[PDB]
């Protein structure tokens, strides 16, 4: 991880919505453990910009730097700090699926992370970072699949909410809450700070 020029693209305020963010809705292992689809070059540093061939052509990305070097740069990388410390936690926030806080990235998005915002939001906010099927599709078509509502109960769908022990709040705005099906998703599990909410 190396910071351009000094840039050092990182939020700290974005840190409180983050877990609140869709990735909430998404127990995808991309905010758990494994590496967002489309990481930000802000840890990586070496060769994958984007990973996706548009934003990461620099080496000749198109299948050997992509399968190779690519994943294995990031992956020789040490993980002694743990993937969390990487764009794990600030998944949301580095991915920016929309629905989220808008005023996040108009006032300290921008301004803060500055320079990797502006390329996100051509990439993931704009057409969406798709990795090689190597290593990261696998996961996380392995995770998404299971992990859409698995938070606590997937059968249910958490629908059903985990309120009956009076939890009050367990860590995405409250409970075991917010189903990833049903109508109105925003049911409980909604963010308190969440723009574009809706479908």
């Given at each position: 991880a190396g910071p351009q020029?000094?840039?050092?693209?990182?939020?700290?305020?974005?840190?409180?919505?983050?877990?609140?963010?869709?990735?909430?809705?998404?127990?995808?292992s991309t905010l758990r453990?494994?590496?967002?689809?489309?990481?930000?070059?802000?840890?990586?540093?070496?060769?994958?910009?984007?990973?996706?061939?548009?934003?990461?052509?620099?080496?000749?990305?198109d299948g050997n730097n992509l399968a190779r070097f690519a994943v294995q740069a990031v992956s020789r990388l040490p993980a002694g700090s743990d993937t969390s410390a990487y764009a794990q936690a600030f998944s949301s926030a580095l991915f920016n699926a929309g629905v989220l806080n808008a005023s996040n990235i108009?006032?300290?998005?921008?301004?803060?992370?500055?320079?990797?915002l502006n390329g996100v939001s051509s990439a993931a906010q704009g057409l969406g970072i798709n990795?090689?099927?190597?290593?990261?599709?696998?996961?996380?078509?392995?995770?998404?699949?299971?992990l859409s509502t698995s938070s606590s109960s997937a059968s249910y769908s958490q629908a059903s909410a985990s309120s009956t022990s009076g939890a009050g709040y367990?860590?995405?705005?409250?409970?075991?809450?917010?189903?990833?099906?049903?109508?109105?998703?925003?049911?409980?599990?909604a963010p308190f700070g969440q723009s574009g909410f809706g479908g």
């Open positions: 020029g000094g840039f050092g693209a990182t939020g700290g305020a974005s840190a409180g919505l983050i877990s609140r963010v869709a990735n909430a809705l998404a127990n995808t453990t494994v590496l967002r689809t489309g990481v930000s070059q802000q840890i990586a540093s070496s060769v994958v910009q984007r990973a996706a061939q548009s934003l990461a052509s620099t080496l000749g990305v108009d006032t300290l998005g921008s301004r803060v992370l500055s320079a990797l990795v090689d099927s190597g290593s990261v599709q696998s996961d996380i078509s392995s995770s998404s699949s299971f367990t860590g995405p705005s409250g409970p075991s809450t917010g189903p990833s099906g049903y109508p109105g998703p925003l049911g409980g599990g």
